[PDB]
Amino acid sequence: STASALGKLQNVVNQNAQALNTLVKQLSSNFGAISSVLNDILSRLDPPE
Amino acid sequence: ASVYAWNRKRISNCVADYSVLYNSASFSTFKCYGVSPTKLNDLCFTNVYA
């Protein structure tokens, strides 16, 4: 009947999922460049930059 | 027009060829900033401003 009695395993799973989620979300940052996708940079300008 | 009254035109719904502009020698300065001059034939834009 009573749930939420297994908080430790839930916490472990949630921490792992959150770490993976933030790691995959980090891919969408400019980091001071002109774009966040590498294909656009490759196909839009000449290599020396 | 004068510099303080620079003339602005909008270009859309057209097929543009930048090669004929680039290969011409009539231009003293041809300086592109965000893109490479030779790749302009491989990109598609909208709402161009001149």
From Swiss-Prot, chain B:
Result when mutating residue 28 to F: In strain: Omicron/BA.1, Omicron/BA.2, Omicron/BA.2.12.1, Omicron/BA.2.75, Omicron/BA.4, Omicron/BA.5, Omicron/BQ.1.1, Omicron/XBB.1.5, Omicron/EG.5.1
Domain of life (superkingdom): Viruses
Subunit structure: Binds to host ACE2. RBD also interacts with the N-linked glycan on 'Asn-90' of ACE2. Cleavage of S generates a polybasic C-terminal sequence on S1 that binds to host Neuropilin-1 (NRP1) and Neuropilin-2 (NRP2) receptors. Interacts with host integrin alpha-5/beta-1 (ITGA5:ITGB1) and with ACE2 in complex with integrin alpha-5/beta-1 (ITGA5:ITGB1). May interact via cytoplasmic c-terminus with M protein. May interact (via N-terminus) with host bilirubin and biliverdin, thereby preventing antibody binding to the SARS-CoV-2 spike NTD via an allosteric mechanism.
Function: Attaches the virion to the cell membrane by interacting with host receptor, initiating the infection. The major receptor is host ACE2. When S2/S2' has been cleaved, binding to the receptor triggers direct fusion at the cell membrane. When S2/S2' has not been cleaved, binding to the receptor results in internalization of the virus by endocytosis using host TFRC and GRM2 and leading to fusion of the virion membrane with the host endosomal membrane. Alternatively, may use NRP1/NRP2 and integrin as entry receptors.
Protein name: Spike protein S1
Organism annotation: Severe acute respiratory syndrome coronavirus 2 (2019-nCoV)
Gene (UniProt): S
Portion of the parent chain present: 348 to 397 of 1273
